[PDB]
Amino acid sequence: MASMERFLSVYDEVQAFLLDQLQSKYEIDPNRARYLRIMMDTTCLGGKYFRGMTVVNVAEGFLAVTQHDEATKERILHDACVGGWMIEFLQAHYLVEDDIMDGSVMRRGKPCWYRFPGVTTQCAINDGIILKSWTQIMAWHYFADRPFLKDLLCLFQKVDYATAVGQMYDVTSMCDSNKLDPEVAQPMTTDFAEFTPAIYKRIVKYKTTFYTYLLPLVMGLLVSEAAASVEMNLVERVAHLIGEYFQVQDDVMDCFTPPEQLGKVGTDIEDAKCSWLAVTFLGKANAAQVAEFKANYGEKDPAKVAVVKRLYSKANLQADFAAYEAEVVREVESLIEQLKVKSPTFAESVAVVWEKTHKR
Amino acid sequence: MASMERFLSVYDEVQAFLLDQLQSKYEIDPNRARYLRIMMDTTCLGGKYFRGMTVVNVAEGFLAVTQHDEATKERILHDACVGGWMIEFLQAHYLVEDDIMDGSVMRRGKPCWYRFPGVTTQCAINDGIILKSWTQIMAWHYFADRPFLKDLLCLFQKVDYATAVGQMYDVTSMCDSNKLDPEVAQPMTTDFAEFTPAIYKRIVKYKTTFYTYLLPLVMGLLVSEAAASVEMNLVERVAHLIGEYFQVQDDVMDCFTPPEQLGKVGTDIEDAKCSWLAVTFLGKANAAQVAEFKANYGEKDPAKVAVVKRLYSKANLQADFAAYEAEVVREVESLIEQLKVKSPTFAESVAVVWEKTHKR
Ligand SMILES: C#CCN1CC[C@H](Oc2ccc(C)c(C)c2)[C@@H](O)C1
Ligand SMILES: C#CCN1CC[C@H](Oc2ccc(C)c(C)c2)[C@@H](O)C1
Ligand SMILES: C#CCN1CC[C@H](Oc2ccc(C)c(C)c2)[C@@H](O)C1
Ligand SMILES: C#CCN1CC[C@H](Oc2ccc(C)c(C)c2)[C@@H](O)C1
Ligand SMILES: [Zn+2]
Ligand SMILES: [Zn+2]
């Protein structure tokens, strides 16, 4: 059975399981089950499933070099699919809540879940909470007798917490740290002193890399009972490195990729986000260019947003991206080589993850 | 050491642990640690700690009749306090998100967390997510080597999911089930056919009783390694019964308790909530009274809200509450007697939980 096909068939099984359990144990009625079914489909499907499929791809790599009965191969693949959906549902939780938090309009060329006429923020915040609760229901049901259940739940929790901390780093990236105070309305920074590569690296590390790369790779190892085939410090170092490049790609696209291709209108400039473009620009601009940046950043006014985009285009950030990319390619290659010592199989899965990121 | 005193000292220890870990492992800066410290204090403290203290009280009951070394007694009490804080932090998550979802103004006579000038909804939604993540960090750290960790995490997850389902039941309690649709803006019910005792019992069962009564009682049993001293079906039956009475008390207070004593202005009528008052009133009103109810319920207009309150006061719902209360007292007494068969100690803890609920 083809990988994607198996993955999508497991979604249907998981959905039927969750919805039946709501009927048999939670006294749900058909209309509320239908609402939750549509919520699940609208928030979980439509993407590329890169995170979920990485779990499956990692498990597939190990099956090719390990002796198992056919029933065990089927069990491992089914577990990798459930594991993959746990991450997809975790991401769905993040996207639903992030969209509400940011007042976002579109997500994947469709309205944000909370903007659906029969949803509203009052329901959507709770819908987002349910999405994350379902990841745990999945784990406890499907992995009840598995030796990896403990490690898997512990990893999932640590990743989820790191991601929430990352979201806090992201939402507060445009204010002066020394001014943070629940009692006082937060002014946007005027000096941009915290728009540095190391501060940018911290936001990205926590907000994206743990759930997008570390969690699918390690979950693939856990379901395969293969964590001994790797040096965990290398897995962490390669996940953070690929994850950072992925976010740099996200940041560049928000500013220059057409809204129809991106699936929404990018607002990082208006939002005064600490993006790779803002940081890199400030790392090479002259005094006059820094003044022009300060006068126009973090403003809704389309004329001010156009000035910032013009500063980025004239600063030749395309060259800085090419240099950054060459250094990442270099470091990713080094780590893949280091991973080959313990597992050529896992190194290959990482090579495929990198290829899919670099070529997207 | 006095119970409440030990409980509050454990909060300080847990807070120091979480904040230090953010510094040592999550690269947090002092200003963001301070923000999270104030968030923790504002959202977790100020209440009666009834839920957290029930865990402690249950564990204390068993210590009085069980042989242990002094170090083991200290361990059990410390675990009961951490367990109690997990529930208090779970409730803090619920209250933060519920307040945002409802557009609430005050909570415990203070502004809702999201209304703090330096917080806003953009941060508060994520702050609420962090509160729940901290319950898991607590469990994995403090109970790492405990035999009850698995059962405790499994119970906590099931309770959290039931509570989120309950919140969905609550937020949709004023619409017609057959009209629920994410694509269509939801009209408020006109017939109130779903304002029945059994539908009211379902909302209350899931939205409050699992986390307010079942979870503290069972957590007290888990930390004591005493789940064999009880018949779990009785614990579930007594928790649902006390929990329902607690919510009936909440519903009555929202309408008749002064805002200064309640800690907020009650809006159940304006919100068209399926409250015990609305259900009980519709269960005894004549055709003319039902028409007057339909014409005035679920409206912001203070004149319409005053009409509904006048219908409740003239319907003599105080007598219906007295009859309901007498039946609950009767059923709670029966279940306590049934619990005495396996554990007079646990039956006594339940007797104390009931007394604290009935006399509040
Ligand atoms: C793919 C797959 C597996 N499966 C196919 C049947 C069905 O398809 C839908 C339904 C709704 C939405 C919004 C989308 C994108 C797809 C769903 O249950 C998922
Ligand atoms: C890609 C990327 C970076 N990023 C921002 C959008 C979204 O944000 C989160 C993360 C964690 C939490 C707890 C919440 C509520 C939202 C997620 O996709 C992570
Ligand atoms: C009780 C207790 C244990 N402890 C005492 C010191 C300190 O007290 C505060 C601080 C802030 C707020 C808002 C409240 C209500 C109490 C806190 O860390 C908790
Ligand atoms: C008391 C009571 C009844 N109730 C309503 C307020 C609040 O609601 C929740 C519950 C679950 C979830 C997931 C959310 C976001 C909010 C909680 O206190 C339960
Ligand atoms: Zn965001
Ligand atoms: Zn972005």
Ligand SMILES: [Zn+2]
């Ligand atoms: Zn509410």
Ligand SMILES: [Zn+2]
């Ligand atoms: Zn209430």
